[PDB]
Structure formats: structure tokens, C-alpha cells
Design a protein around this ligand. Structure first.
Ligand code: CL
Ligand code: CL
Ligand code: CL
Ligand code: CL
Lengths: 443, 443
């Protein structure tokens, strides 16, 4: 099992703590293919996408899409944070990612994807207010949450509050401004409008670039989902849940570190407003499953019942920490989304799981199977998930965006560093929780 | 009030019976403005869009979109049928419209819009199987229903069954085939795929050209609506209702005229399947309004609650004859759609009514107001609607596609012959029902 990592000399960033963690997990695992896949995937972000300048900046590419997503970058380095106290260079690089993220938010808090400098690119032609520092300007609530999540974990783990600079203060004020704009209370249209001349229906917005109507009940409108597909009803439930938790983290930072209580209070009160509106509008009494969370709602009474593989998703709510895994409405939702009552759940000869309209019919995303494992309370279920992930990689040793339910050799995104990070993180979690016997029972 | 009709020498088709009807209504009406609008609108189709070859063919343009829609053409000559027994040339022309519609269906039963010959046009580059005889190929269930409706009413009025030729037999077989393909039972994708590179989200289809998934519960998928906007969930309820009725008319024709009892039974069997599925899936228990009809459903349990102005619409069900006007679920739906609980209902300084995502926020379609009048059981409501139509035409004396809720001078489609026909039809209906005194009470 020769590694599919790049040759040592070609790896973009090296962490001694990451290398020792990998050596350790390989030693513990008896399944040689699993160990090989772990080694391929866990460090892929560092091997292939990290540009650390040695000082205060880290730019992080997604993989086979050559720009930096706020979402991807916040996830791509997530499991490394727990190693930061053992590795000074790793710690500096992580602080650089967070500092870069806040600078990106400051450039445009509506934008999902950024260039390293001012290169422009193919989406300068989009019918929206573009700057050459942007790769793409799809408004996605979760773009602003992932950096807050990363920064909070980095701070709690390391005690290093120096990331909460004047650029952070500018950024978090932009986050509040943007979230409140997108409650669309005074104007159904507003400051964010997006169209693109494209054949892909979900890469442009309905109603002349304004999206489908919302009734302004307190939820935050998201123009696009974490899949980068346009929302159908703009009050995207998983992303609103993620906003609640992220604003509360922000409030704690603002009170404790910055002594900026007015901004903290604005975060707290907005979080409570969004949470109250989720309780009032995001629940659907399903005749089969009982009370479940809707995927998207419009505030008029429409509720879209589905899930999409991309995190934040319904199945992943407890992974991000937005609900407790025991939440009865979550457990009902979990049963619903992993069934043929979900329009984007697919089952065939090669496996089963959730995809979405991004790639279309019958294309299962490994992320959904990973999130089923992350949120499982049952060993047999976790084992089934891990074996499926091993048996649906087309022998590449990496995580893909999606694969066909009847043929894993038909797959999308060969080099998707967020997904590789998630797989490494999953295996590490399971080993650290004392479940190496379960993994070693895979023959 | 000088007429806005063309001068006599520029009128494309002249009917003696239509002129007699106009002169009769003008003499009965005492409101000069209303009489003027009637005269402008009722014959607009004949005046400006009809090309009858004197034999067996009539081509009918929409107005300011220079192609023939199966929907528009089937409605544009509808109110003239009742005059056909007294005007041989009008009769011949109507039979020519029908014959042309069956010819169109035989060219491509998935296509909405046709050229007179092989001119091609802007949409030849669409990502679908195009032919130069097509102006557009957006699959809309109602495209196949409007011709059957016209044909049945022409047959019942005139007794002329000569229109039900071998070309009809081919055509109705294609209708059955197409409807059944679009139940999507054995293949969730199927023979019809459509994308277009466009900034307009609803002018292309999701999921790589297949649209959003449907669970094959027996309903018929419509890729697009009568607005020409893509469906959100493909089992479009008003169109499925229209299909049931249209299939039963076709069964009657096939039994009585063509002596084809097996093909007739195939129509009836399908009608019964769609009807059963509408009962099981199309009803939503609205907490404010009671049981209502959903606008679109996917068969998985998703139901979209709204209405769009274009007929077939929810408000128009009794106009087309698909439900009785005192169906309790219909009456509940009627209250819901004409309310701010409908995302596409707008109220402003100029009036109120229903639009849709075709033209977008705040744009009300006169068709919705007309349909409210057509389906009204109250003289005062009827009078209010007629007054609103008169007060929202920007002084043009014609019916428009849409007008801004706060300013009727901001309007779309100055020359829209379907809409002009509907207005004439409405006024004629009210006079023929004995309600001229109501019309003459408008000051
Ligand atoms: Cl649009
Ligand atoms: Cl509060
Ligand atoms: Cl095993
Ligand atoms: Cl009056």
C-alpha cells in the first residue's frame, strides 16, 4: 500500500505533530487499507493546499477548485487545532488561516470564495457587485459561521486571543450587519442581488436576482446553500441553526477578550431571535416520522422536506453542536433524511446516502455517510459507514464529492481537501474515543 | 373614444358574426369606456394574429411574441366558437386552428411554441432536441390540454367531427404516450431533458436538465408552468386537474366519433389514475384556511402553497371546469390564494391580485383579476373586478401581461391577444347571463 500523498519534498506545509499522529494511528489500526486511506486523507490539506507565509497569513485552496472558500478552509484545518499546543509552526499556520478569513470577510461579507491576491477570474461577469479579490460572490450564511467556529476552537484550545484583533472587530460587525440585512425586514429585495448567465438553474436566483419571497419572521435568508446551489426557500434551516451557535461564540469572545459588550449583546439578542423563529417555523409534523426539522422555509408557511449532503445539513446538526444528538425532533429528522421519503436520498448496488441537486440524481456524497457516522450512537452503524466509505472510493484512497449509487467509478472531484480532512477527522475521533477495536474488526 | 382596433384594411381576419356580436354589446352597454375596451379586446385575435389560408389551416400568433403557443391559440379563439353555426368562414377558420394544433402536437408533443414554417429562432441553441419548426420546447402539460378543450367545444357546438381525422388519432396517441412518459414510473429521467444558458433561473431546469425529483405516485410531471417558468415540484396541480378533464373529453370523442373504444378506455384509465393521485397528494390542511389545494407537489410529501396568475391556475379550476365552484376545498383555496399568505399575491395603490415569479415581485397580472370575476358567485365582487381591470390598463384600452401594484403605467406586454380575448369573453359572458344592468351601473 504505497501512499498517495505527494513526495515529502513537494508537500506544501509539514507539521511534525500531524506526522506523529499519523504514525500513531497507523500503528493502532490493523486494517491496512484503512490505515493507508487515513494517511492519504488526514494531511491532504497540508500536503496540497496550504500557503503559509511564515508570519500572519495562510491561504488555503479547496483542492481541484483553485480558490479559497470560507467554508472549506474553516473545515479543512479543523482537526489540526487539537494538535496546536504540541507544534508551534502548526499553531502559527492556524492563526494565519483565521486572520486571512477575517480579512476576506472584510473584503465582502456576502462572498463565499476568494483569490489569494486580485487575480479576478471567470466569475467577474456575474450580475452582482464583484471585486477582483473575489473568486465568487454567492451569499451563504455558513460562510460567515465557519471562521467564527474555527477561531473559537483555536482560542479555547490554545488560549491565544491575539487573533481577535481590530480586523476581527471589523469582521464581526460586518457579520451582524449582513445577517440583519438578510432578515429582509424593511425591504423584500435589499443590498444583495445575484444572477449569472448559466445553464445550471441553481447557479442564478429567481425573481430577477432577489430569490423566492420571504415573510420576515426573524430568520436569516441565505441566497445559496453550502452546496453552492441557490436555496428554494431562503430561510435555510441548518444554516440558521449554525448562525445561532456561531453568534453565541462571538458574544463570548466579544465580552471576554475584546470588552466590546454592545457588539456582544447584539450577537446574543440576534441569536435568541433566530432561535425563537426556528422553534416557531422550522418544525413540520410528519405523518410517518413525527415532528421533524424542515430543510428550508419561507415564513409564509412553505416548508421543504429534504436534506442535502453539505454541512451544515440536517443530519449534521449535532456534529456542528447546534442541537444535542438526543433531541427527539433531531432523531425523527435523522430517520426521515436517510430514507426514500427524502428526494435526495439514493440507494443502489454500491451503497446509499444523501446527495442533492448540485450533481443531481443518484450521486451519493461521502460527506453524508461520514456525518451519519459522526452523529451515530451505535457501533454497528458506525462500522457499516466506515466500510461503505472504504468501498466507494473507486480504489483512489481519497474522499470524493459524489459517486454513483450503482458505480463508484463514476465520481466527482478527485481532489477535495475538505472531504479528506473530514475522513481523517472521523477516524481520529473514533480512535480517540476508544473504538479502535471496532475499526480493527473490519476485515 | 376612437377605437384602438386596426383600420379595417389591416385586419387579418374578419368575421361577420363577431362584428354583429360587437355591435350588439356596444348598443347594450351604457359605459362608453367599457364598450370601447370590449370592442378593442374581443376581436383582437382576429384583427391582429390570425392567418387563415382559406382551406384547412389557421396559424395564430400570440401578439408581441411572434410564434404560436398551443395554450394561447386554444384560448385566443375560444369565445368565438359559440358563434360558429351562424358564420361559415368563422367556422372554417376555427377548424383550421384545430388542425394546425394537431399538426404541432404531431411535430413534437413536448413543445409549447411553434413556427408557421421552419424559421428557427432565438431558442434553437437550447440544450434540448430542437427542430426549426419549433419556436420553443418547454414541456407544459397544459399545451396538450388546450387543443383538446378547443376541439371538444368546437365539436359539441357545431357537430363537425371532420376535425377528428387520422392526424387527430396520431396526436391523441402522442398525448397519451407523453403523459405516461411523464409519470416517470420506470425512468426518473426520461425522454425529455431541457436546459438553456440564461440569467433567468426558471428558464432552465435543475438536476442537469431533469428537474427536481418526483416519486411516481401517478401524477403527470410538468417541466414548466403555463407562465413558461420551470416548476419547483413537477406534479403541477392545476395542470393535472386539466389533464383529467381533457382525457375524458378525448375518451368521449374516441368512443363516439372514431369508434376506438380501447384507446378511449386508455384515456379514461389514465384520467382515473391522475384523479386518484390528486385526491391523495394535492390537498394540504392549512391551519388558517382549512383544506386547500397545493400548487405543486413532488410525490415525496412536499407541497408548494401559492398560486400563479396563468391559467390553468388554482383560482381558475372552475373556469376550466375541473372542479365545481362550490367545492369546499376550492373555496378555501380561493381565500388562501387571494391573500398575503400567498407569496405571489400583491396589493398596492392601484389594485391587488396574483402574479408569479415570471415577472417577479409586485407585478399583478390582469388574468388573475379576470379569473376572480369568472369564478365569482357575487355581483358586487364581479363589479369590483371589472372596475379594477378598467382602472389598471394605463389608458391603453387593452389587457396587459402584468402591471405594477403601485403604478399601472409600469406594465408588461402591450399586445397580448390571449388576455384581450379573455376580457371580451368575460364581458360577453356577463351580458349573456343577464348581467348587463350590473355592467351599466359602473359610472
Ligand atoms: Cl427572473
Ligand atoms: Cl433575548
Ligand atoms: Cl468486515
Ligand atoms: Cl361605479
Amino acid at each position: 500500500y504505497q501512499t498517495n500523498r505527494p513526495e515529502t519534498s513537494k508537500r506544501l506545509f509539514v507539521s511534525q505533530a500531524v506526522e506523529q499522529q499519523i504514525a500513531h494511528i497507523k500503528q493502532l489500526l490493523t486494517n491496512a487499507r484503512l490505515a493507508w486511506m487515513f494517511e492519504n486523507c488526514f494531511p491532504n490539506t497540508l500536503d496540497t493546499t496550504v500557503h503559509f507565509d511564515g508570519k500572519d497569513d495562510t491561504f488555503v485552496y479547496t483542492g481541484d477548485i483553485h480558490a479559497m472558500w470560507l467554508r472549506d478552509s474553516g473545515a479543512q484545518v479543523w482537526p489540526y487545532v487539537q494538535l496546536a499546543n504540541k507544534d508551534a509552526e502548526l499553531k502559527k499556520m492556524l492563526a494565519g488561516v483565521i486572520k486571512r478569513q477575517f480579512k476576506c470577510i472584510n473584503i465582502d461579507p456576502y462572498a463565499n470564495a476568494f483569490n489569494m491576491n486580485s487575480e479576478g477570474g471567470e466569475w467577474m461577469s456575474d450580475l452582482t457587485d464583484m471585486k477582483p479579490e473575489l473568486h465568487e460572490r454567492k451569499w451563504e450564511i455558513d460562510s460567515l459561521c465557519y471562521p467564527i467556529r474555527l477561531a473559537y476552537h483555536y482560542w479555547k484550545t490554545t488560549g491565544d486571543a491575539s487573533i481577535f484583533s481590530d480586523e476581527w472587530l471589523t469582521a464581526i460587525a460586518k457579520v451582524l450587519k449582513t445577517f440583519k440585512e438578510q432578515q429582509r425586514k424593511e425591504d423584500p429585495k435589499g443590498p444583495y442581488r445575484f444572477q449569472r448567465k448559466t445553464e445550471r438553474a441553481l447557479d442564478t436566483m429567481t425573481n430577477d436576482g432577489w430569490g423566492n419571497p420571504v415573510k420576515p419572521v426573524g430568520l436569516i435568508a441565505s441566497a445559496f446553500r453550502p452546496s453552492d446551489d441557490a436555496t428554494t426557500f431562503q430561510f435555510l434551516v441548518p444554516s440558521n441553526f449554525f448562525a445561532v451557535t456561531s453568534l453565541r461564540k462571538a458574544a463570548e469572545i466579544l465580552n471576554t477578550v475584546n470588552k466590546k459588550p454592545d457588539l456582544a449583546k447584539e450577537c446574543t439578542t440576534l441569536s435568541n431571535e433566530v432561535e425563537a423563529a426556528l422553534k416557531k417555523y422550522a418544525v413540520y409534523n410528519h405523518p410517518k416520522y413525527g415532528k421533524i426539522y424542515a430543510f428550508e422555509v419561507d415564513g409564509f408557511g412553505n416548508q421543504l422536506l429534504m436534506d442535502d449532503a453539505n454541512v451544515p445539513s440536517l443530519i449534521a446538526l449535532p456534529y456542528l453542536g447546534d442541537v444535542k444528538v438526543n433531541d427527539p425532533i433531531y432523531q425523527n429528522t435523522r430517520k426521515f433524511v436517510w430514507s426514500e421519503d427524502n428526494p435526495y436520498f439514493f440507494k443502489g448496488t454500491a451503497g446509499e446516502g444523501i446527495g442533492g441537486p448540485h450533481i443531481g440524481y443518484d450521486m451519493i456524497w461521502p460527506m453524508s455517510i461520514m456525518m451519519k457516522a459522526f452523529t451515530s450512537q451505535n457501533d454497528a452503524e458506525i462500522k457499516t459507514c466506515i466500510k461503505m466509505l472504504m468501498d466507494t472510493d473507486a480504489g483512489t484512497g481519497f474522499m470524493h464529492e459524489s459517486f454513483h449509487k450503482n458505480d463508484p467509478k463514476n465520481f466527482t472531484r478527485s481532489w477535495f481537501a475538505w472531504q479528506n480532512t473530514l475522513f481523517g477527522e472521523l477516524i481520529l475521533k473514533l480512535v480517540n474515543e476508544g473504538k479502535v477495536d471496532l475499526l480493527n474488526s473490519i476485515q
